[PDB]
């Protein structure tokens, strides 16, 4: 009679690369890199984004007349902004510390708009001013959240006002300065020429005078407005004073949530779907440690790597009764990885060592978890904006991100290749060790046939075979061997 020791083989075409060899077909493998996304912009954590459409952040907060639908925005999960928006500053100008403000908004999910300086308080100034540049349906206008203060009759009294932040939380206040294209314009609008705008809080102290000069026309106007902003802390008072050229805020914005968010650049719109990880190309529903969808994501996402595949072998080299492991792999043993195949007078059979397979199995599942559970995820907005005078900082930020990406891509690929090699050698050692376990138990009561099979020198029925396949056997007799 005889028993042989063997490895399961299969009908798998799954291939895994290792350090020493490539295209190793294996019986089982796990792909740990996520390559699929929905193609849709979803509600992160079930809360929809702020959809600015063609509005820029400055347009939104200043009240560009074309952003009238953004005048009572509810809580957002992330901000969705188009690149190169149109509804920015309707009146040409610039916004100071703009990138820094956009950064601030990565921590804001909702604002409460508060009327800090009602436009009808300015009883000594004209507050009905506007221009064709901000016109609505041909009707000249101005930013919705601000008051352009000009002369009343022929006078421009010093304009004063203040606000003491009793709103319950730190507030964002935006105001600006008008810089005329001429002196005649300065006199027509403000009467006074040697003007200034003065603003301060317990921490801010600024005074600015307008620059009157000829400039190229933008949106039909030669003049420009500059906007500045500050956060007024709780219980602090902001004081405004002006002799001309002041664009006063009417509203401030109380920061109501202060949670973690971010600004995503995309040309799409919100779809009716949900996600825990949103990329600009669409949401990602996954459990894997790595993805290769897009470098910038908002949410708690798998790590991004520059690779096509990360596949861990979990199974045996797939190499397709009589012959044992040395020749190849039994298609028949589908009840485990390692096992016995045997024959006697009672029956041909096939079997799996359950002890060996279970230990090997747990080794492999621990291996996979040791790789995938070591990745540390977190919420990250992954993105910053820089001005055109900050190239040395933008490039520094880029280098940092590219540097870490190369490190992690490299580590992911080398760990996978090194582990796949060990996995396949692990399985090869386990079948060889099984052969020796049995060989030692059988000693001289069998003949080794040289192909992973032991021929018996005595009759060995199913009871005799079962015990061998379990670690029990002793026959110091029947020396047919002579």
């Amino acid at each position, epitope marked *: 009679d005889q028993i042989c020791i063997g490895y399961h083989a299969n009908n798998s075409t799954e291939k895994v690369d290792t350090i020493l060899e490539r295209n190793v077909t294996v019986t089982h493998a796990k792909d740990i890199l996520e390559k699929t996304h929905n193609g849709k912009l979803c509600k992160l954590n079930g809360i929809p984004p702020l959809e600015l459409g063609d509005c820029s952040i400055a347009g939104w907060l200043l009240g560009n007349p074309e952003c009238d639908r953004l005048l009572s925005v509810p809580e957002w999960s992330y901000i969705m902004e188009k690149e190169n928006p149109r509804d920015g500053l309707c009146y040409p100008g610039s916004f100071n510390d703009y990138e820094e403000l956009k950064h601030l908004l990565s921590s804001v999910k909702h604002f409460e708009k508060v009327k800090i300086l009602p436009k009808d308080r300015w009883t000594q100034h004209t507050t009905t001013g*506007g221009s064709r540049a901000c016109a609505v349906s041909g009707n000249p206008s101005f930013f919705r959240n601000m008051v352009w203060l000009t002369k009343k*009759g022929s006078n421009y009294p010093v304009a004063k006002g203040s606000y003491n932040n009793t709103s319950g939380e730190q507030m964002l206040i935006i105001w600006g300065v008008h810089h005329p294209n001429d002196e005649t314009e300065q006199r027509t609008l403000y009467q006074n020429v040697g003007t200034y705008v003065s603003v301060g809080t317990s921490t801010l102290n600024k005074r600015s005078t307008p620059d009157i000069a000829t400039r190229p026309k933008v949106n039909g106007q030669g003049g420009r407005m500059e906007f500045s902003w500050t956060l007024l802390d709780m219980w602090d008072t902001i004081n405004f004073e002006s002799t001309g050229n002041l664009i006063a805020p009417e509203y401030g914005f109380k920061i109501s949530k202060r949670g973690s968010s971010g600004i995503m650049k995309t040309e799409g719109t919100l779809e009716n779907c949900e996600t825990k990880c949103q990329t600009p190309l669409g949401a990602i529903n996954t459990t894997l440690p790595f993805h290769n969808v897009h470098p910038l994501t908002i949410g708690e996402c798998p790590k991004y790597v520059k690779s096509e595949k990360l596949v861990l072998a979990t199974g045996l080299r797939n190499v397709p009764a009589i012959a044992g492991f040395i020749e190849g792999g039994w298609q028949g043993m589908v009840d485990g990885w390692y096992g016995y195949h045997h024959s006697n007078d009672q029956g041909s059979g096939y079997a799996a060592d359950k002890e060996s397979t279970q230990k090997a199995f747990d080794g492999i599942t621990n291996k996979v978890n040791s790789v995938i559970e070591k990745m540390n995820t977190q919420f990250e907005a992954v993105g910053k904006e820089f001005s055109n005078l900050e190239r040395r900082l933008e490039n520094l930020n880029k280098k940092m991100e590219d540097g870490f990406l190369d490190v992690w891509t490299y580590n992911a690929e080398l760990l996978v290749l090194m582990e796949n090699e060990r996995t396949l050698d692990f399985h090869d050692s386990n079948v060889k060790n099984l052969y020796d376990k049995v060989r030692m138990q059988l000693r001289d009561n069998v003949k080794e046939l040289g192909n992973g099979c032991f021929e018996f020198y005595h009759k060995c029925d199913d009871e005799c075979m079962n015990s061998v396949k379990n670690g029990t056997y002793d026959y110091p007799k029947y020396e047919e061997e002579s």
Partner: antibody
Amino acid sequence: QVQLVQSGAQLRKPGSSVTVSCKASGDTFNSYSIHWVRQAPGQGLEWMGRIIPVFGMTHYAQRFRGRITVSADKSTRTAYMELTSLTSADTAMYYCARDGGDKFHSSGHFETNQGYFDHWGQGALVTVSS
Amino acid sequence: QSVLTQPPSVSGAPGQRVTVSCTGSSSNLGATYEVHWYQQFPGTAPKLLIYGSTNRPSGVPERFSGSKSGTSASLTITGLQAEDEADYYCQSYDTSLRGFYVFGTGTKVTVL
């Protein structure tokens, strides 16, 4: 003062049109706008519309949207008003007026719309009848 | 469209104070807009009498003075003279109907 010279009276039939015009003493180059005001006999004043020749901008009273056209040609320094779909009710005198309130500038634009008429034309009577 | 309501007429003897009211609304006398006043003699184009709700053009007598509060306004003529027989009108800018200027109904002033 500022001279604004208005065209004379005209008689028109219902279903036709009316053309009234005023030559301004440089108001089509300087920056004061030109407005049209109507007054039916025995009635008060009605605003009809305006032009700002500096920018080529116009604005009309709601009652005449689609009926009133205002244009100007600064080379002759004249503002024109054209009324269509003329009816028997359009027997009012028409006046031009200079807005001495909102002063405009080139390479910019700004209105407060708190202006007033400092200089008026003479008044062109238009009679509409069969 | 003819929002600024004025009394059909007012009157008084020479030497008396005569006032003309102008009542508007939240869209045009309110909303910070100023009211101008004009003086019109029969057969003649109206002329500016008061502007900015208080100031007078050069050539206008001190006897004419404007006043404004809330959504209401008035013109005061003191020292009424025999020659002050004219229709008076108030004007302001109305923000409704995409914007228009509104003149009032007019007041006739009769000297007794």
